[PDB]
Amino acid sequence: NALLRYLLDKD
Amino acid sequence: PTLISLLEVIEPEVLYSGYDSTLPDTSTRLMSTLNRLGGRQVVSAVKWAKALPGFRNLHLDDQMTLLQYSWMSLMAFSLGWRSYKQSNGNMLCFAPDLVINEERMQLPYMYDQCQQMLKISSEFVRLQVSYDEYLCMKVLLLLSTVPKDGLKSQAVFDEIRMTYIKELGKAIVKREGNSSQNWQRFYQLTKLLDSMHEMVGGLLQFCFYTFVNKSSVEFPEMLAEIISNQLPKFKAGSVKPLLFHQ
Numbered sequence: 511n512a513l514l515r516y517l518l519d520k521d
Numbered sequence: 522p523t524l525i526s527l528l529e530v531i532e533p534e535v536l537y538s539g540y541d542s543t544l545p546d547t548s549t550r551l552m553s554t555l556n557r558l559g560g561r562q563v564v565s566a567v568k569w570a571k572a573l574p575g576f577r578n579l580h581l582d583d584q585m586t587l588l589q590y591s592w593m594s595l596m597a598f599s600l601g602w603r604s605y606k607q608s609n610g611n612m613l614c615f616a617p618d619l620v621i622n623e624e625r626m627q628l629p630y631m632y633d634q635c636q637q638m639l640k641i642s643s644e645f646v647r648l649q650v651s652y653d654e655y656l657c658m659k660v661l662l663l664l665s666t667v668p669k670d671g672l673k674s675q676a677v678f679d680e681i682r683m684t685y686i687k688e689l690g691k692a693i694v695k696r697e698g699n700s701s702q703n704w705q706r707f708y709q710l711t712k713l714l715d716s717m718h719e720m721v722g723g724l725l726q727f728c729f730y731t732f733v734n735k736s737s738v739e740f741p742e743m744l745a746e747i748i749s750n751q752l753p754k755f756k757a758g759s760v761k762p763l764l765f766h767q
């Protein structure tokens with residue numbers, strides 16, 4: 511969900 | 522600037538658990554410390570995967586799926602590797618501050634799962650796997666478990682696998698120096714990859730059990746999010762393990 515989605519989009 | 526050298530550079534640094542063996546040794550503390558370490562390692566693995574040439578060509582949903590489906594395999598494979606290098610497969614080397622003795626495995630609450638994890642490292646010992654072989658296989662593990670209903674960007678995924686199967690070939694050559702029996706080496710490494718589903722299946726089983734029946738063990742949000750998402754799909758038999766040999 512949200513946390514995995516964040517990590518893939520970040521940086 | 523080769524693909525294998527890039528895999529060397531993007532390989533995550535070995536993390537420290539911060540385990541405090543001055544405190545009392547209990548089952549709950551150990552599994553919670555290992556879960557916290559695992560959560561951090563998974564975060565690193567996401568960063569690692571994002572840096573793999575090709576991975577970002579995949580649809581975001583496919584990217585999430587592959588990480589959700591293979592995370593345990595990646596962790597256990599890495600643990601197998603560390604244990605092979607640090608102690609020749611005699612000890613479980615979770616972290617340089619959290620190394621489990623043969624004597625520390627003789628505890629009832631952790632004997633079985635430790636034996637399962639040692640089997641992985643003993644395969645590295647048996648095959649004398651090289652560093653580049655390990656790195657190529659690890660990429661392929663990320664690409665080894667898929668949904669039965671398929672994937673959103675199948676063609677890209679098929680080309681990625683193709684790319685890293687060839688890189689594994691280069692790793693075999695870099696180690697042996699062009700033998701005529703390199704096909705036997707390739708066969709042995711693909712057989713090891715295949716057997717990772719079974720060797721890890723029992724680890725996921727115990728993990729899912731501990732997560733559902735809270736038999737009080739703490740899971741960080743990173744692991745909790747993946748496990749609770751991964752859980753109903755395995756029970757539905759909706760996951761397809763990719764195998765090189767039928």
Ligand SMILES: C[C@@H]1C[C@H]2[C@@H]3CCC4=CC(=O)C=C[C@]4(C)[C@@]3(Cl)[C@@H](O)C[C@]2(C)[C@@]1(OC(=O)c1ccco1)C(=O)CCl
Nearest residue numbers: 552555556558559596597600615631634724727728731
């Ligand atoms: C048997 C499973 C498999 C374990 C993972 C293997 C792979 C792994 C390697 C690590 O280096 C750090 C963390 C994990 C990701 C582990 Cl040790 C933990 O989260 C903890 C995990 C899930 C596990 O660990 C144990 O029970 C365990 C480890 C040692 C003795 O028991 C568990 O179910 C706890 Cl809920």
